[PDB]
Structure 1
Amino acid sequence: EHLTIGFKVENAHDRILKTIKTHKLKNYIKESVNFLNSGLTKTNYLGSSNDNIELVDFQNIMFYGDAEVGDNQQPFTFILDTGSANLWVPSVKCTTAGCLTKHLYDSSKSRTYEKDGTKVEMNYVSGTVSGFFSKDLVTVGNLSLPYKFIEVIDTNGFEPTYTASTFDGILGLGWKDLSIGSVDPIVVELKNQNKIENALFTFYLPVHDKHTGFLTIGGIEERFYEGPLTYEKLNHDLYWQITLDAHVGNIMLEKANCIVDSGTSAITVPTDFLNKMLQNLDVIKVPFLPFYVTLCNNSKLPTFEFTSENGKYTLEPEYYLQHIEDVGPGLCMLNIIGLDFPVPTFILGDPFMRKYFTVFDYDNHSVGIALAKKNL
């Protein structure tokens, strides 16, 4: 009854393997492991200010390439983004080098296009994205609706990952940001136009296929989860952010903010917490390569524990460890990085969501967490 669409996923693990085999680093890492755990070091290398992990390197990219905008248009590949509120489409008027690569939306070829022209300009540290609002018939799966999206005329802002990747535009799955426009998120707008039952969407990430995920819009398909579904109300009005008592074994954090984000390939930890976490854990950071390594046989590998008033959630090693056994006997990288926010926060990315079926409820302003069903 509810619309469920399938999408492809590109993660850090994918991008890293590319880098390793592109430059034949099959034995730089292998030797770097056998050394930085020898005890010679007297302290394992977890990174430096010089050699660190950037969140952009662990950017989880979900491809949905069968959506439409307008009548006579090229197809557009969008990426899901729970941190954005709007739909962003590269205009045919965009003259940047990144746009020349992508499929561009020509409003003059669309029979159902209504001009808005409300300018949207953002100033990112990575550059500048510029454009204006446009209304047209947008189609996702078996759902269509007149929607105000953004025609981008300048893609320099996020171009680093833009020309690198293969997607054309962005599909917002976050909360309305009035600094950009008064337009509602496409999932909300579908509810506004009574095309879906409720203004919510769910993420089912198949634990055994990290290249695949499923987005369901409008309702909660019971089959996706087992056990009790727990709701955690949001502590923010712009993010899918909740408060959980977060601890790993003996080290503990209280009332920490936690963001659920499919667009992150990892569990991000506060840097200071991550350090006390990984002391003498036979886990090292490969120098000048953006990932931590350990032999997957590791006995002392910790389990994340997130506690709230209504539920408790655990992330065992099984979920943040991805086998790089192809690069050498025993090894596996960790989908865990260090990231500092003004307030101590965790990003509950892909690994958390591989274990837990996640519900994003606009109407109830909360995140619903349930143990995903592994069997179909």
Structure 2
Amino acid sequence: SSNDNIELVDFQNIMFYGDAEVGDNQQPFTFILDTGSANLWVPSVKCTTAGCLTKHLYDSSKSRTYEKDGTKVEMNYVSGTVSGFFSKDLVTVGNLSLPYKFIEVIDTNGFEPTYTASTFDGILGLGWKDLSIGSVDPIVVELKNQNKIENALFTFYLPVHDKHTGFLTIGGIEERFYEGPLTYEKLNHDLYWQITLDAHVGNIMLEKANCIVDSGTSAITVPTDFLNKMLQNLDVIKVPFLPFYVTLCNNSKLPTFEFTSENGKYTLEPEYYLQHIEDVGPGLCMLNIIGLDFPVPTFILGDPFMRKYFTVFDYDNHSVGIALAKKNL
């Protein structure tokens, strides 16, 4: 068949991770595979902060193919800076390798306590060129330019806890991952993977909303007027001053999301967006839904939508393909 398959392992419903390697000595890292960002971030041996000391670390000096670039990278994150510099070396994802401009991270003093909390070493972006720091070409675009993959496209088939493992697949579409038709939705900007759909939840309707498909987000985010409208009378309880909503897991009044285009119709039922706190039926659950206002009405179709729908990200045809994920492998 061909095609590069990268196993996705789940970590307690919050996130999933894939393995990649750096340098020709094959230095192993755990990565967040993030369609909402466009850079490869790797922690350096020269990083000496609590947490870096818990992570797998990059050592340029052990790698014959290291290629100095040193270009300073400064990123003032929300109260605390993340900083490093550019390096080039041989990145290996699955069974493919290529030279790539990544960011060797020196300091993580604004990505805490997030970094130490989780068990990933780095972040690997999969967005578009215009979204990167420096002007780095997307890994998949490059692999196509270097004739290593058939098509400039990747797919996500996400893990489902205690059910199956998952895959990022580079280079072509694999039939085993889905059921039903595979409809395509054209990008409306080459930045995030963003498409135009009509969003409809029972009575509430919003025509031609911007929908970002993003593996790096673990909620469905929703415009706040939408959320407010849609939660009235649902027997849901809002924990005061925090983006959390608590419900019995069997609340039969929970609504289904509806996204429609000319080409297709996508729904996301309660069972896909509930987090189970406890299952002593009727169970306690939280809604995996955040209100979030963008300059333009936007939905972030994150991990919950991707768990149900298999997704194709196509650089060549400037589009996202969506199909129902096979319940099993």
Q: Find the residue that maps to 2:131 and give its secondary structure.
A: coil
> Is the CA contact (8 Å cut-off) linking 1:53 and 1:290 kept in structure 2?
no
Shift in alpha-carbon separation, 1:188–1:340, aligned structure 2, 3 A: same
Q: CA deviation digits over 1:161-204, x for unaligned, max 9?
A: 11221211111111123661122111222112111111111111
Distance 1:182 1:210, change over 3 A: farther
Q: 1:61 offset after TM fit, Å? A: 5.7
Change (3 A) 1:83 1:265: same
Which blocks of at least 5 consecutive residues in structure 1 are unaligned? 1-47
Counterpart of 1:149 in structure 2 is 102
> Kindly tell me: are residues 244 and 62 of structure 1, through their superposed partners in 2, closer, same or farther at Cα, counting changes over 3 Å?
same
* CA distance in structure 1 between the partners assigned to 2:3 and 2:30 by the alignment: 36
**Whole-angstrom distance in 2 between the partners of 1:354 and 1:100:** 33
Deviation at 1:250, TM superposition (A): 0.3
The alignment partner of 2:48 has SS state of coil
How far 1:275 moved relative to its partner? 0.9
- What is the TM-score normalised by the length of structure 2? 0.89
- Offset at 1:353? 1.2
Deviations 1:98-134 (A, max 9, x none): 3233222111111111112222222222432222211
Residue 221 of structure 1 and its aligned partner are, at CA, apart by 0.2
Q: 1:108 to 1:57 in 2, by over 3 A?
A: closer
Structure 1 CA distance for aligned equivalents of residues 56 and 265 of structure 2 = 44
Deviations 1:267-314, CA, capped at 9 Å, x for gaps: 111112111101011111234665312222222211100111211111
C-alpha distance in 2, partners of 1:242/1:172? 19
Q: Structure 1 vs Structure 2: percent identity of aligned residues?
A: 100
| Deviations 1:2-34, CA, capped at 9 Å, x for gaps | xxxxxxxxxxxxxxxxxxxxxxxxxxxxxxxxx
Larger deviation, residues 290-299 vs 167-176: 290-299
Q: Secondary structure at the match of 2:208?
A: strand
3-state secondary structure, aligned to 2:227: helix
Contact 1:98 1:159 in 2 (8 A): no
Aligned length: 329
Residue number in structure 2 paired with 1:97: 50
Tell me what 1:185 maps to. Answer: 138
Normalized per residue, the structure richer in helix is 1
Q: Provide closer, same or farther for how the CA distance between residues 101 and 53 of structure 1 changes in structure 2, counting only shifts above 3 A.
A: closer
Once the 2 structures are TM-superposed, how far is the Cα of residue 328 of structure 1 from its aligned partner? 6.2
Distance 1:127 1:147, change over 3 A: same
Structure with more strand by fraction: 2
Deviations 1:136-160 (A, max 9, x none): 1111111111222111112223233
Mapped contact 2:7–2:165 kept (Cα < 8 A): no
Contact 2:4 2:169 (8 Å CA) reproduced:
no
- Whole-Å separation in 2 of the counterparts to 1:49 and 1:326: 42
Conserved? CA contact 2:6–2:167, under 8 Å: no
Contact conserved, 1:60 with 1:350, CA < 8 A, in 2? no
Structure 1 vs Structure 2 CA RMSD: 6.9
Q: Do the aligned partners of 1:73 and 1:106 also contact (CA within 8 Å) in 2?
A: no
Distance 1:58 1:90, change over 3 A: closer
Structure with greater Cα Rg: 1
Check conservation: 1:58, 1:265, Cα contact below 8 A: no
- Are the counterparts in 2 of residues 58 and 266 from structure 1 also a CA contact under 8 Å? no
Q: CA deviation at 1:366?
A: 0.9
CA contact (8 A) 2:6 2:19 kept: no
Q: Secondary structure at the match of 1:64?
A: strand
Q: Normalising by structure 1, report the TM-score.
A: 0.79
Q: Residues 251 and 178 (structure 1 numbering): CA distance in 2 closer, same or farther, change over 3 Å?
A: closer
